[PDB]
Amino acid sequence: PVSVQQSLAAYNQRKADLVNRSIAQMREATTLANGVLASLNLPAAIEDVSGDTVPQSILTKSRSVIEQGGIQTVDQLIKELPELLQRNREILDESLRLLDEEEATDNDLRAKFKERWQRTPSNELYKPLRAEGTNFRTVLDKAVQADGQVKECYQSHRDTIVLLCKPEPELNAAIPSANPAKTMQGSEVVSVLKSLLSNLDEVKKEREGLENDLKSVNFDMTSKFLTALAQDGVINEEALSVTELDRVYGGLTTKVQESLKKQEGLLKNIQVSHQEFSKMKQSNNEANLREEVLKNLATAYDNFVELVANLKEGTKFYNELTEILVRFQNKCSDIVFARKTER
């Protein structure tokens, strides 16, 4: 309660959460937009003015996947995961084998002798280790569950990706060619839509800035903490941190609230606008093919995007988890060493 070192540790904890939480809000909002925006396929069906073909905000989206490497990026990563996770089951399962085994020796030693086997029991001693052990496990299970959720997600969408790596066959398939092109071109309500759609980008973009700006902050409370100790007999970490957390992130916290509760206005004022776009109800047949598809295309893009990250980071994770468990292992085997070497 008067240690600067621990006081610092708290700040990093409190700082990290502030930042993380803030990043998460923005990343979930960006995806929630893309879902809405592709649930109504706006980029696709404004650029559909030239009905015939429509290589538009999707050839765009196809080029960037070709750039990306297509499934050959995904399909490679996905197959790689179970091995990584198996590595991790194993390290944990050994650590606990080591433990279960000495413990069993110990248990029969006090059984055979009694008084004369007077050390403190492995029962009791490895209770923390086990506690620790079972959390790793919790992590794994949830990791398996999340990894399951992924395998369905791409598995399902995959069809709609393979078809997005074509330069001219793209038409003959993707394009149903509905003949729907309306003289309803760049009319008043179609331009108010383009800007309201490109505003959302200037919104989409700044979120990188906001994110990076948030991570780039480093403050260092040491001086602040020492001075509180040398003025009062104590350190009141919560109060010191809160007050300096606002001074340092409060200006980036509003920019976060002001990116979110601005998206609110931009969202609900299009649900309306997109209906005020189709009170002309086009054609419930050929344009169906023209419609539902474009709606099913941007989701194939959006979902691909969110699919590399999940993967890339599940990987990153797994290898950090590993370097964590190994440490766990060693600790178990050290403690085990301590017991044979004991007395």
Swiss-Prot record:
Residues 59-343 are annotated as: Interaction with SDCBP. It comes from Homo sapiens (Human). Self-associates. Interacts with SH3KBP1/CIN85. Interacts with PDCD6 in a calcium -dependent manner. Interacts with TSG101 in a calcium-dependent manner; PDCD6IP homooligomerization may be required for TSG101-binding. Interacts with SGSM3. Directly interacts with CHMP4A, CHMP4B and CHMP4C. Directly interacts with CEP55 in a 1:2 stoechiometry. The interaction with CEP55 is required for PDCD6IP targeting to the midbody. May interact with PDGFRB. Interacts with SH3GL1 and SH3GL2/endophilin-1. Forms a complex with SDCBP and SDC2. Found in a complex with F-actin, TJP1/ZO-1 and PARD3. (Microbial infection) Interacts with HIV-1 p6. Interacts with HIV-1 p9. This is Programmed cell death 6-interacting protein. May be phosphorylated on tyrosine residues by activated PDGFRB. Changing residue 321 to D: Impairs rescue of PTAP-type L domain-deficient HIV-1 p6. The modification Phosphoserine is found at residue 122. It is linked to Microcephaly 29, primary, autosomal recessive: A form of microcephaly, a disease defined as a head circumference more than 3 standard deviations below the age, sex and ethnically matched mean. Brain weight is markedly reduced and the cerebral cortex is disproportionately small. MCPH29 is characterized by small head circumference apparent at birth and associated with global developmental delay, impaired intellectual development, speech delay, and behavioral abnormalities. Affected individuals also have poor overall growth with short stature, mild dysmorphic facial features, and seizures. It is found in: Cytoplasm, Cytosol; Melanosome; Cytoplasm, Cytoskeleton, Microtubule organizing center, Centrosome; Secreted, Extracellular exosome. The modification Phosphothreonine is found at residue 120. Multifunctional protein involved in endocytosis, multivesicular body biogenesis, membrane repair, cytokinesis, apoptosis and maintenance of tight junction integrity. Class E VPS protein involved in concentration and sorting of cargo proteins of the multivesicular body (MVB) for incorporation into intralumenal vesicles (ILVs) that are generated by invagination and scission from the limiting membrane of the endosome. Binds to the phospholipid lysobisphosphatidic acid (LBPA) which is abundant in MVBs internal membranes. (Microbial infection) Involved in HIV-1 virus budding. Can replace TSG101 it its role of supporting HIV-1 release; this function requires the interaction with CHMP4B. The ESCRT machinery also functions in topologically equivalent membrane fission events, such as enveloped virus budding (HIV-1 and other lentiviruses). Changing residue 150 to D: Abolishes interaction with HIV-1 p6; impairs rescue of PTAP-type L domain-deficient HIV-1 p6.
